[model samples]
Target: DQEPSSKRKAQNRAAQRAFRKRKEDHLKALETQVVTLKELHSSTTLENDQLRQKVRQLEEELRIL
Candidate 1:
């Protein structure tokens, strides 16, 4: 026989609310991460550009200068 008032139902309700907040937190974290990623890309590209130029310069100089 099932009870009309349930301890299990109460626990489930609490867990459901917690799950809702967890999803929101994940969304906010991803939004912040996008900004950080953009900054990282900017710095990364400059370093890459300089390294590429150095590689080109080295290859050209190696042509018996």
Candidate 2:
């Protein structure tokens, strides 16, 4: 039997809420990863903006070569 229209609408709204919550958490995880990588990369390699820029320039040169 078909569900009642009101019940169906309520279920749809609940599912959307759950989906949005999951997406929010997923984005938070991505932000955390970006921060961690930035810290690690800065400390381990770049150390400063000039070093980072030099690396980028070298990478571009490599692509052309």
Candidate 3:
């Protein structure tokens, strides 16, 4: 009976370790996704800024015309 209990405990510990490793991997993947999205957002913001400037320039020219 004691041996069976010890074996069960070992199994439980192994399962816990595996779960922890999987969770860590998932967190790492999420971090990578966030970084990628941040970079994409920065690039989009710059593009939008340039477009806004163009619109402002056109509006100013139209007003003069």
Candidate 4:
């Protein structure tokens, strides 16, 4: 059940971001951040895989010949 004020309040917050994002080319930095973050994610996954492989190898090594 929606109240009388709810929709108006929600639209106000939506407009706040929409209007701000529409001006001054702030989205340029956002696109740059998205590109950098994509590269960061690739390295993070690569490191995680390397770490997992190391742990598995050490554990099996310790299991004895």
Q: Which structure is stronger by lDDT: 3 or 4?
A: 3
The number of clashing residue pairs in each candidate reads 0, 0, 0, 0
What order do you get sorting by lDDT, best first? Answer: 3, 1, 2, 4
Estimate candidate 1's RMSD in Å.
3.8
Two-way lDDT contest, 2 vs 3, winner: 3
What TM-score would you give candidate 1 relative to the actual structure?
0.52
Query: Which one is best on lDDT?
Result: 3
Q: Which digits, one per residue and each the tens of the lDDT, describe model 2 over residues 11-53?
A: 9999999999999999999999999999999787645877889
List, residue by residue over 1-65, the lDDT tens digit for candidate 3.
44658788899999999999999999999999999999999999999999999999999999998
Which residue pairs collide, candidate 1?
A: none
**How accurate locally, in lDDT, is each candidate?**
0.94, 0.91, 0.96, 0.90
RMSD of 2: 10.1
Q: What does candidate 4's lDDT look like per residue over 1-65, in tens digits?
A: 66649889899899988898786467888898999999999999999999999999999999996
Write candidate 1's Cα lDDT for 1-65 as tens digits. Answer: 77546878898898999999999999999999999999999999999999999999999999878
| Candidate 1 least-lDDT 10 residues | 1-10
Report how far residue 15 has shifted in candidate 1, in Å.
Answer: 8.4
Global Cα lDDT for candidate 2: 0.91
Off by over 4 Å in 3: 1-4, 62-65
- State residue 56's C-alpha deviation in candidate 2, in Å: 23
Pairs clashing within candidate 2:
none
Candidate 2: regions farther than 4 A off: 1-4, 46-65
